[PDB]
Amino acid sequence: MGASKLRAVLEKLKLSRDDISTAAGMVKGVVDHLLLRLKCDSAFRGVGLLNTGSYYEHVKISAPNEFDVMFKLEVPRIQLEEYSNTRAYYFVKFKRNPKENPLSQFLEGEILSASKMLSKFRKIIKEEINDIKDTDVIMKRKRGGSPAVTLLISEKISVDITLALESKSSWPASTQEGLRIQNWLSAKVRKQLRLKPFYLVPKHAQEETWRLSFSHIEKEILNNHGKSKTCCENKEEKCCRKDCLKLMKYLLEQLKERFKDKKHLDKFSSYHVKTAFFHVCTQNPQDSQWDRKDLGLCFDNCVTYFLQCLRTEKLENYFIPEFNLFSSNLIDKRSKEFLTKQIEYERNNEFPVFDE
Ligand SMILES: [Zn+2]
Numbered sequence: 588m589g590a591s592k593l594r595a596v597l598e599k600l601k602l603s604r605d606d607i608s609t610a611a612g613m614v615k616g617v618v619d620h621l622l623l624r625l626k627c628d629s630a631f632r633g634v635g636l637l638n639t640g641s642y643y644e645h646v647k648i649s650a651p652n653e654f655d656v657m658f659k660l661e662v663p664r665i666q667l668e669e670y671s672n673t674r675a676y677y678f679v680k681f682k683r684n685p686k687e688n689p690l691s692q693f694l695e696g697e698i699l700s701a702s703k704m705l706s707k708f709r710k711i712i713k714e715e716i717n718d719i720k721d722t723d724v725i726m727k728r729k730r731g732g733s734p735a736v737t738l739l740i741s742e743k744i745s746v747d748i749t750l751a752l753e754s755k756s757s758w759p760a761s762t763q764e765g766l767r768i769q770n771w772l773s774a775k776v777r778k779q780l781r782l783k784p785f786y787l788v789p790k791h792a793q794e795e796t797w798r799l800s801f802s803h804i805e806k807e808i809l810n811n812h813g814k815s816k817t818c819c820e821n822k823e824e825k826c827c828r829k830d831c832l833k834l835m836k837y838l839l840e841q842l843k844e845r846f847k848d849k850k851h852l853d854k855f856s857s858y859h860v861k862t863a864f865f866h867v868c869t870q871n872p873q874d875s876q877w878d879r880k881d882l883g884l885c886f887d888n889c890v891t892y893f894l895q896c897l898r899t900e901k902l903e904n905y906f907i908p909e910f911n912l913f914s915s916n917l918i919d920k921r922s923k924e925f926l927t928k929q930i931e932y933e934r935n936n937e938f939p940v941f942d943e
Pocket of ligand 1: 812813818819824825826827828
């Protein structure tokens with residue numbers, strides 16, 4: 588009745604795999620066509636798809652009508668400038684003059700404008716959809732932000748397109764003490780990953796700032812998650828790390844759905860639960876600590892960690908330690924206290940929100 592209740596939840600989540608894989612092929616077709624149009628613009632010359640996120644991390648449990656798409660764009664010779672003491676928000680400057688780089692049209696005086704660039708990006712996708720008489724793909728006129736472009740394929744699939752800059756540079760100094768995988772995935776692996784580029788997605792806190800993004804590293808360490816190189820590659824090594832992340836994601840989803848009226852949980856996201864999960868992985872580096880037989884025990888440790896972040900109002904970004912995702916400024920004290928009472932109730936009543 589214990590971990591077997593959770594096993595039955597995970598079995599129910601497999602039924603939606605065929606509907607999610609069908610709808611992912613719908614999005615890929617649309618996104619691949621938009622990528623060809625974006626490649627025609629000399630500003631979006633180096634544009635490419637970044638195959639990161641829940642679907643590619645094999646943790647896309649539910650919401651077959653909701654997808655998130657990422658688009659990279661190589662920005663060579665970059666110059667960063669930390670916005671205030673927000674260790675994740677930066678200003679994008681250029682190491683060499685405007686004639687050299689093609690993004691020069693979006694420069695708002697030595698500083699790249701995220702609003703000037705996202706408006707061009709939106710304008711291209713909009714005219715591409717308008718030119719094509721297909722009544723299936725429709726762009727929704729949103730409030731702003733990033734993903735600033737949100738599409739609706741076949742009047743059902745909502746897609747969230749995000750634009751990101753790729754910097755093949757050394758990661759910013761704010762990430763110096765982040766990614767604590769040395770005793771789990773190894774010091775060799777941490778060195779290897781830190782040589783890979785980092786991304787910058789437009790996000791305010793000055794409106795012309797960009798937040799650091801490591802969606803690729805998150806995918807890389809989720810699909811190679813064990814200390815043993817052969818983890819989940821055979822019957823004797825099937826761990827429950829991904830099952831736990833799936834269950835934490837589903838716990839937040841169902842709680843958000845249950846309280847979609849008194850909206851306290853709308854500030855919470857599947858990224859908060861993913862970030863907390865990576866911290867639980869750092870606390871439990873052995874594959875012994877993630878046995879398939881101990882699913883109940885492992886999921887309970889994931890819930891307890893998340894409860895501690897809500898109670899202490901502290902959830903560090905896995906890559907930028909000084910960036911507190913649960914800071915009083917990003918999420919208020921009352922929303923965190925409300926979620927704490929709901930997770931405490933769920934944990935105490937054998938999780939009724941999962942049940943049929
Ligand atoms: Zn494994």
